[PDB]
């Protein structure tokens, strides 16, 4: 493998998806250099089932990067075993989740004085989500199911926007496509 994994094109993107409609980018057939993620702003870096200092020596059959924007106080919901209106209605991780969660404060880019209404979350649904399920329907709840974040630079930290990237590590009885150097 001569190609390098396009982490740069995931983390340094101008635009992130809404949490109700989280975006998945597939990483494959590449060399996974994780030093940059350790090197940087990226205040939140929690790995489950794997050590962040050993990723340089591992091989995977696939790596999946799930990108979305949430509030600072909602960052704790992006973890296995957790519940809440993000964990239950927007983005659910499995209890046996294997992977790393990276998040940073994007107030400088996403917040607006008039209010940034581009980012939305789901508040109403008839049931909870299954692991890695996505629901982007707008059917009226027996309420309009989606509501804006309205991010502003005048908000305290808990209400400031955070950009979250979840790196899921797939390990199967199959030839690896992604290996560190």
């Amino acid at each position: 493998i001569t190609n390098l994994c396009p982490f740069d094109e995931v983390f340094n993107a101008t635009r992130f998806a809404s949490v109700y409609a989280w975006n998945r980018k597939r990483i494959s057939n590449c060399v996974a250099d994780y030093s940059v993620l350790y090197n940087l702003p990226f205040f939140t870096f929690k790995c489950y089932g794997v050590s962040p200092t050993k990723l340089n020596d591992l091989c995977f059959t696939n790596v999946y990067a799930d990108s979305f924007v949430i509030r600072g106080d909602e960052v704790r919901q992006i973890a296995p075993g957790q519940t809440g209106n993000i964990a239950d209605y927007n983005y659910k991780l499995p209890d046996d989740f294997t992977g790393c969660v990276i998040a940073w404060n994007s107030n400088k880019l996403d917040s607006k004085v008039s209010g940034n209404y581009n980012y939305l979350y789901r508040l109403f649904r008839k049931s909870n989500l299954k692991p890695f399920e996505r629901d982007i329907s707008t059917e009226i709840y027996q309420y309009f199911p989606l509501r804006s974040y309205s991010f502003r630079p005048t908000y305290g930290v808990g209400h400031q926007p955070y950009r979250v990237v979840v790196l899921s590590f797939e390990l199967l009885h199959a030839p690896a496509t992604v290996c560190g150097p």
Partner: antibody
Framework: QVQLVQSGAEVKKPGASVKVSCKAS????????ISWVRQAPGQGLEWMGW????????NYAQKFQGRVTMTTDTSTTTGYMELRRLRSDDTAVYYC????????????????????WGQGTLVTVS | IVLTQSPGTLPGERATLSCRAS???????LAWYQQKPGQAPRLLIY???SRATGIPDRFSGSGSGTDFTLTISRLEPEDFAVYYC????????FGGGTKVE
């Protein structure tokens, strides 16, 4: 230690085509795209188009949509551009640059700019 | 998106250069370039604020909405060049160019 080395000046007749090369080194070729910008004498910078070194995807400026073709060769880590049916108004210096404004793998916009530039290739039409 | 720069033509003094867009341009999609005589343009500012590697601290950019600027806190003999603004919020454009003299 990134460098971009372009071919020397060319002189063409009206209706002729010119192909300008740009050899890249000092970085992983397939991790960054290639952009082309030209500058006519006394003028500013005009964007011609962009190509991904990873998947061959292109994005051209409307002005050259039917005139310019861009290709890459990953074995020689070199970019190429061809501009067809040249006119006297196409006399300009054509520059190559390393593109970190759009991703090569996903095609999405990045937070960046054109950091590394070649010396420029002068093309004269007469 | 159309980018208009001013003044047409502007050592040790502070310099300010302006670039106004006809349409809103995101902080993430705007950059500034410098071109010396006989040389290719180089990147100075990206993300409307962050400095490119190798760029002196005297160069700083900022802005929002449709109004962005580039400031040089004191001009050096080598800072006399043509500066350009760029946006890639929609397609990719360059401004007319502003000369420091």
């Amino acid at each position: 230690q990134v460098q971009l080395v372009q071919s020397g000046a060319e002189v063409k007749k009206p209706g002729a085509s010119v192909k300008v090369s740009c050899k890249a080194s000092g970085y992983p070729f397939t991790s960054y795209g290639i952009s082309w910008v030209r500058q006519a004498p006394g003028q500013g910078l005009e964007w011609m188009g962009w190509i991904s070194t990873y998947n061959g995807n292109t994005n051209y400026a409307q002005k050259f949509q039917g005139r310019v073709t861009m290709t890459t060769d990953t074995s020689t880590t070199t970019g190429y551009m061809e501009l067809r049916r040249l006119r006297s108004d196409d006399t300009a210096v054509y520059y190559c640059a390393r593109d970190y404004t759009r991703g090569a793998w996903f095609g999405e916009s990045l937070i960046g700019g054109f950091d590394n530039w070649g010396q420029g290739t002068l093309v004269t039409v007469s | 998106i159309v980018l208009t720069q001013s003044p047409g033509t502007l050592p040790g003094e502070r310099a300010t250069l302006s670039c106004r867009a006809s349409q809103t341009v995101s902080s993430t999609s705007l950059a500034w370039y410098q071109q010396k005589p006989g040389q290719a343009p180089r990147l100075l500012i990206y993300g409307a604020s962050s400095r490119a590697t190798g760029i002196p601290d005297r160069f700083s950019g900022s802005g929002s909405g449709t109004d962005f600027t580039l400031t040089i806190s004191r001009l050096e003999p080598e800072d006399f060049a043509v500066y350009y603004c760029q946006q890639h919020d929609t397609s990719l454009t360059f401004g007319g160019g502003t000369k420091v003299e």
